[PDB]
Amino acid sequence: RPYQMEVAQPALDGKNIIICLPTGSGKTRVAVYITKDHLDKKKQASESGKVIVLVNKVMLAEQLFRKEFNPYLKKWYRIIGLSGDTQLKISFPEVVKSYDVIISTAQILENSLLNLESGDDDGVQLSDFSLIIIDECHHTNKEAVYNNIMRRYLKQKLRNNDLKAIPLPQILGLTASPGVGAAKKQSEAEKHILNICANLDAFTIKTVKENLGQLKHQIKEPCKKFVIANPFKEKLLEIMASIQTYCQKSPMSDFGTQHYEQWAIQMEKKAAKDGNRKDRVCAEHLRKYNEALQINDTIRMIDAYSHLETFYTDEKEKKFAVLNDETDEFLMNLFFDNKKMLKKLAENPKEKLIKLRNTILEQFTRSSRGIIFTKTRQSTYALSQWIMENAKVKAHHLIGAGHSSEVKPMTQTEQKEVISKFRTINLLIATTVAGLDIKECNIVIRYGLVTNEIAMVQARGRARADESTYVLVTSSGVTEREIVNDFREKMMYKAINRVQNMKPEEYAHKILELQVQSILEKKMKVKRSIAKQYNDNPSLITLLCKNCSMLVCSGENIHVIEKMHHVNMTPEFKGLYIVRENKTNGEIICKCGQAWGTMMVHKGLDLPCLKIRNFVVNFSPKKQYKKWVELPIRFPDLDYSEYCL
RNA sequence: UCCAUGCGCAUGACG
RNA sequence: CGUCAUGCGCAUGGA
Ligand SMILES: [Zn+2]
């Protein structure tokens, strides 16, 4: 392509660069062009032609292995589409020793490199290659993993320069808008761009200026648009005030925010440091009440009632299964005295939801397509069920994959499923997952959201088909945030055009400085990291429960499996804990009712594994970490010769 | 295909 | 530095 021609042109001979273009301009295709010409150059030179294409995500890897690299190189060259989940019969160093072209994923590579410079399995170095290709360069700032790679590259380049010579590979680099970082200033942005380049050790950026018109003919752009707009709550607030007085809790802030939550968690910390009740227990309950609040700010109040209903339901189930004090008695009765009545209040009408329904219905009377963003998963589920109740345009939710923070997440397969159904669902409900292959779209809304400029442009790329209906529902400073996204998009060109028109000498000087700076930063960080974990004590401690400061385990009685998990056999421990299971790894609970861990099935054994998240330490410098890795002191791996017979 | 777990990473808001 | 929310990758064991 013509616009692609010049931007590719320098890379054809040396010229480790960056490229940045907008959505839809087929950057994969030009990348293929550079590949084929490079490999043909190596056939002309009879040199080791190798390309080790990198990404951040598996799905783009599979996508390109289907659609882009094979259909243009299926004949000439060897290709393979790699991942961490796709079980490959062979290790990585062989697909280095074969398969001249590689689609891949990042941390596979770094793992092989570590195995190189740390023993185990046959390693690999960068010197085996002649070229590297990247997508989404903008992640190359804050030691994100595909930046260890270039720090190694920079280390070896400076070894070459102190020599000045073992060779090193050409380095392409692609991206959308390259992102700007922590800026209200042009100088900071410029410095950021230079940090990015020197983390890639590139030469220029080389964007498109000549043929912007033939390209503009392709990209129909969206229209930047804004479309913007008790008593049940107050009863709950009065309950909260009652509880504050009940245990002398000083908020130092208002109800319905994050600050209140933060102070509650700090009370939980202090009271575990004390081992005292009525203090952290209230922190937990008020954390729950504040959840209910700041969903009530945005969600139908029935959903908060259901949230806390299931909560206290589980609480009663815990305590009864335990039995099968005044504090929990007060709290439970305080809830259940108002439970049914608040259920009654929840049905009453009287919002963001109302303007929202209005906009939505008006578009679907205008138009077919539908996209929704927001912050959280529970919001997606709740609004999905709610619109399923409200008289309608079928719908479906979407969320990510992490098994974190409340929910049973979804599946990659099922994500693909729902996306194809949308290629048929009318309106999707998603968290920040949806920069992906969803085009020909109208009404990407932002219901109670914030995003950054790069997320903004990735959302732009998804709304197409000659119809943009950017909508925003948060007012009754968020309009500020689209305005600053525009401002940053202006600033980025303002800085790129300043650095393109820059001397090569001073350019090289600044980039060398930033390279040395980042390398020394990594070195000092590794120093402090090695200094970090040095204790490795067998048994120095006693693990106690956190509601009740009762002894639970000792320092030596613990053992390790899978070099991941911890366990306490020695059924003197078994005199303590209680089991539960409802809906196949059953859960443990306390002699009070605290939840502790899981009965993990391992090699026939029902080992009781516990999570440090729900226990407290006594070396009494009481401490708490939430993660074993925080704790330097080491425990042994298990020897089954104990359990025999 | 599903389950559970550990680890690292970035983003945004907040202090 | 911590908190929250969100998203991503890798490595495990099992069905
Ligand atoms: Zn207890």
Author numbering: 310 to 473, 479 to 543, 549 to 643, 670 to 695, 699 to 715, 719 to 743, 749 to 780, 783 to 792, ...
Question: Anything the authors wrote about it?
Answer:
Helical reconstruction of the filaments formed with 1 mM AMPPNP in RELION produced three maps with an overall resolution better than 4 Å (3.68–3.93 Å). The maps had distinct helical twists of 74°, 87°, and 91°, respectively, but similar rises (43–45 Å). The intermediate-twist (81°–91°) and high-twist (91°–96°) structures have 15 bp of dsRNA and no interpretable density in the catalytic site. The protein-RNA contact area decreases as twist increases, with 2,315 Å2 for Twist74, 2,102 Å2 for Twist87, and 1,926 Å2 for Twist91. Within Hel2i, Gln581 is positioned in the Twist87 and Twist91 structures to form hydrogen bonds with either or both bases of an RNA base pair. In contrast, in the Twist87 and Twist91 structures the Hel2 loop does not form any base contacts and is less firmly engaged with the RNA major groove. The two residues form interface II contacts only in the Twist87 and Twist91 structures, with the C-terminal tail of the adjacent subunit. Consistent with this, in the mid- and high-twist semi-closed structures (Twist87 and Twist91), the Hel2 loop is less firmly engaged with the RNA major groove, the RNA backbone is in a similar position as in the ground state, and the overall helical rise is reduced by 2 Å relative to the transition state. Hence the RNA is less distorted in the low-nucleotide-occupancy Twist87 structure than in the transition state, which has the same twist. Notably, the Hel2-RNA backbone interactions of the Twist87 and Twist91 structures are in the same register as in the ground state structure (Twist74) despite having the same 15-bp footprint as the transition state structure.
Uninterrupted RNA duplexes longer than a few hundred base pairs are recognized in the cytosol by the innate immune receptor MDA5 (melanoma differentiation-associated gene-5; Kato et al., 2006, Kato et al., 2008). The cooperative assembly of MDA5 into ATP-sensitive filaments on dsRNA induces oligomerization of its tandem N-terminal caspase recruitment domains (CARDs) (Berke and Modis, 2012, Peisley et al., 2011). The helicase consists of two RecA-like domains, Hel1 and Hel2, and an insert domain, Hel2i, all of which form contacts with phosphate and ribose moieties of both RNA strands. The helicase and CTD, linked by a pair of α helices referred to as the pincer domain, form a closed ring around the RNA.
